[PDB]
Design a protein around this ligand. Structure first.
Ligand SMILES: Nc1ccn([C@@H]2O[C@H](COP(=O)(O)OP(=O)(O)OP(=O)(O)O)[C@@H](O)[C@H]2O)c(=O)n1
Ligand SMILES: Nc1ccn([C@@H]2O[C@H](COP(=O)(O)OP(=O)(O)OP(=O)(O)O)[C@@H](O)[C@H]2O)c(=O)n1
Ligand SMILES: [Ca+2]
Lengths: 441, 437
RNA sequence: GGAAGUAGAUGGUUCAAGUCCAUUUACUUCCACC
RNA sequence: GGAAGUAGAUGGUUCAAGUCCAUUUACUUCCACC
């Protein structure tokens, strides 16, 4: 099991075969023919145009180049026009920057409008750097595509490929820069082993330095962090995987792992072994794009976790899942049930003015003195984390994300017990509690 | 009803009737006759020697003055022999300083050996300051020394009289000094409201300055605090009580409240409504004096209390009770049961060597990363506060006071729920939980 | 949409809030959907 | 007996202990038992 023999096998998992390549060549040809004939300035960009796309992930990126004088309104009207004009069938769905997603001869295509700039300074739209990224990489990546494909494959198999909010990992463009920076997959992995949260990679300068955060300097624009949306945790996982890969190299690192169907009965056993409170907030999925929905689920998850922690339910971890129709916020707490009384701190016996109004209150028990200050016994209006959340989410829905919070206003319920183990959340449940052997292929 | 109308009606319960005084005089004489028969220099000090004892607190303090020639060990043997051959029956039991306690013609007596000195500063034993104390008070407390007996009665009714550990309150002498410093109990009550914990009262200089701590400076030794054993919380209680009295006066402030007997059934009801975990540590009371016991019971109570908090059972309060044959450490926690799993913080991801060690320990569940560490799920040995204290007391008996600890070491049990309300701890549980009716 | 920051405001909880729970106006950034 | 203080010496827990849990030696000051 030699390292180089491992990577040679890995190639068969990440290099697309002849039939896929040809399928994309045939599509490419058709697209060009349609876009000429339309007049229209365009440019193929991204992994297709650089032959760095992953086996089974063929998708062509076309960028339409407009006069910078155009309004943003004019950009979308025209982008959508041409995109629609050029794709066999199509779909329009985006967060901020408009574009058309479609198919040309059975292959995924994205037609994206942008601005024909010269110098990626000042930037009129979010995506204006992409043509420049391509000019830059074009001649610096020839002969190193398979190398980029290994890294991509390695990341994806470990669930940290892509910088969208659903994954918060490594973009494809980031993979290319790393390969340009280190020369090979093997060199990257070897080096990544010693990246820190303060690591700055400046590709254009061929330099590694200490900064305020992890920062991969864009060759085309130095104020840009190519790794802006890679989370601290995903960086950590990557660094750790590299360490593990070099200790014990294996083809396992390039094969995806799938959730495994775990029976409700065994889940009941694990939860009662841990003796925790496990429950979810269930509600209708708001009909919005992933990049709007996921940060909103992140916020909702966080605020309720914070509520649980200030309310002394000792939350362990937290998870979320989105189905076609429902979303789920998963929670685990050390405390299944708290007492009803608690102590509220009072004023120091010194100043009477405050002590007077502190004792003026009607309570059931009778304040006392401890360490030179008054304290009182007060009652909770809930004693289980479920009851707690039910109070929280009914009362604070507006702080849980624009659309997520709105959906919770109109309907939510709290599921625990067997009722929760038959929901499609077992993968997230297992992940959350760190159940061993979960997890396969 | 009004200002000084109440003080009249109280003086009935503080000043002793003539026939209690008459029993005590016929006991005083008999004592002089026995001591002089033996020769022996003797000074009378304390409350009886100043006419400041409560109606029922009849005790006589006698001090034996030994020449300094006799050493610390010679002192006590002769002081004991004298005390034994001067009291009808006698009891010897003390914490550090030797004395005989006994009865003459049916009257409580204390015989305490000490030294005769010129100059108070630079003590030999411990009580040497006391004759000096008295000779500073003989001509200063003269007159309406009933302003003391009201102050005493006040503090006694409210559970904060004596300055011994069981109480941690106001010394008898501390009372007589304040009456000299302010002029009268009422005037003392007026001022005590303004007292902080920074208050320093200098009877000698008439100086109400603000030092680092509550310090009643002794007229006989300025290095020494007369209030040195009154606790912070006990001070708080008085300062408040005075405020409560000043505004709305009542004779109730001089009557001791009946200790309040609540039935087991009502207590269980209170506790179940409270939703807490209430349990006690019961063990055999070690055969020691109060002043060695109570601080140990406190220890003890505190160390287990801290165990409970660092163990996330969120304790509310604690208390303790001493009986004939048993002691009880009383606890109430907000958490009746905790989960088996908990999180353990590991290292930051960069620190590759310590990550290896951390990840190499066998656990039931896969560790995880969160904000750049490395955390692990671990399993607890216990899930209930009672379960928890059973362990801590078993392993940490030695940190729980010399004797209390030794006693816990050989045996204790944990009493909770139904079994507990049958033990003599209900008054303590009521005070603890602030039960009110 | 989400996140950071700067300058105001409002409700609630509390003996007690610039600070805890929320709401809101103006502005400067940044990220994703490529 | 308990508490405060100064100089050390350990053992345990932990990825890691001058920081958490305990133990010990010497010098010191305090408190109650009056
Ligand atoms: N977060 C992102 C997303 C995209 N891009 C730019 O957009 C191009 C196209 O991105 P995308 O289609 O999302 O993926 P690819 O880079 O083409 O690679 P792959 O499809 O294999 O993920 C990239 O090359 C890059 O220049 C970027 O800079 N940062
Ligand atoms: N903590 C104390 C208590 C007592 N004493 C000295 O011991 C004398 C007698 O105190 P004690 O007999 O213990 O109580 P009484 O002063 O007699 O008060 P009472 O009779 O109400 O109990 C006091 O006058 C005082 O000089 C002292 O200095 N330190
Ligand atoms: Ca693409």
């Amino acid at each position: 099991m030699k390292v180089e023999e491992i990577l040679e096998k890995a190639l068969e998992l990440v290099i697309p075969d002849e039939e896929e390549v040809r399928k994309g060549r045939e599509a490419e040809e058709e697209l060009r023919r349609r876009l000429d004939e339309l007049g229209v300035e365009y440019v193929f960009v991204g992994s297709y145009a650089r032959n760095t796309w992953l086996k089974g992930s063929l998708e062509i990126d076309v960028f339409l180049l407009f006069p910078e004088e155009f309004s943003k309104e004019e950009l979308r009207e025209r982008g959508l026009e041409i995109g629609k004009a050029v794709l066999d069938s199509y779909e329009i769905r985006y967060a901020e920057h408009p574009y058309v997603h479609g198919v040309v001869k059975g292959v995924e295509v994205d037609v994206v409008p942008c601005y024909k700039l010269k110098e990626p300074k000042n930037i009129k739209s979010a995506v204006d750097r992409t043509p420049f990224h391509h000019k830059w990489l074009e001649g610096r990546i020839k002969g190193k595509e398979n190398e980029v494909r290994l890294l991509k494959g390695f990341l994806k198999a470990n669930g940290i490929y892509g910088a969208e909010y659903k994954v918060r990992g490594f973009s494809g463009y980031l993979c290319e820069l790393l390969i340009v920076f280190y020369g090979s997959f093997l060199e990257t992995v070897k080096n990544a082993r010693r990246w820190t949260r303060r690591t700055v990679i400046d590709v254009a300068k061929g330099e590694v330095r200490k900064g305020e955060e992890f920062f991969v300097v864009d060759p085309v624009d130095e104020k840009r962090n190519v790794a802006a949306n890679l989370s601290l945790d995903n960086l950590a996982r990557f660094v750790h995987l590299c360490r593990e890969f070099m200790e014990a190299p294996s083809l396992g690192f390039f094969k995806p792992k799938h959730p495994l169907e775990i029976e409700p009965e065994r889940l009941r056993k694990i939860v009662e072994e841990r003796g925790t409170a496990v429950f979810a907030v269930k509600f209708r999925k708001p009909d919005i794009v992933d990049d709007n929905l996921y940060p909103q689920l992140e916020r909702a998850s966080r605020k309720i976790f914070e509520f649980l922690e200030r309310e002394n339910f000792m939350p362990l971890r937290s998870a979320f899942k989105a189905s076609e129709e429902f979303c789920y916020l998963l929670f685990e707490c050390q405390i299944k049930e708290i007492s009803r009384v608690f102590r509220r701190m009072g004023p120091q016996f010194e100043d009477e003015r405050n002590v007077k109004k502190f004792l003026s209150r009607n309570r059931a028990f009778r304040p006392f003195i401890e360490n030179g200050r008054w304290w009182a016994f007060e009652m909770r209006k809930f004693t289980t984390p479920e009851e707690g959340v039910r109070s929280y989410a009914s009362t604070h829905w507006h702080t849980l994300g624009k659309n997520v919070g709105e959906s919770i206003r109109e309907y939510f319920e709290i599921i625990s017990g067997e009722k929760l183990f038959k929901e499609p959340v077992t993968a997230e449940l297992c992940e959350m509690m760190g159940v061993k052997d979960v997890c396969c292929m």
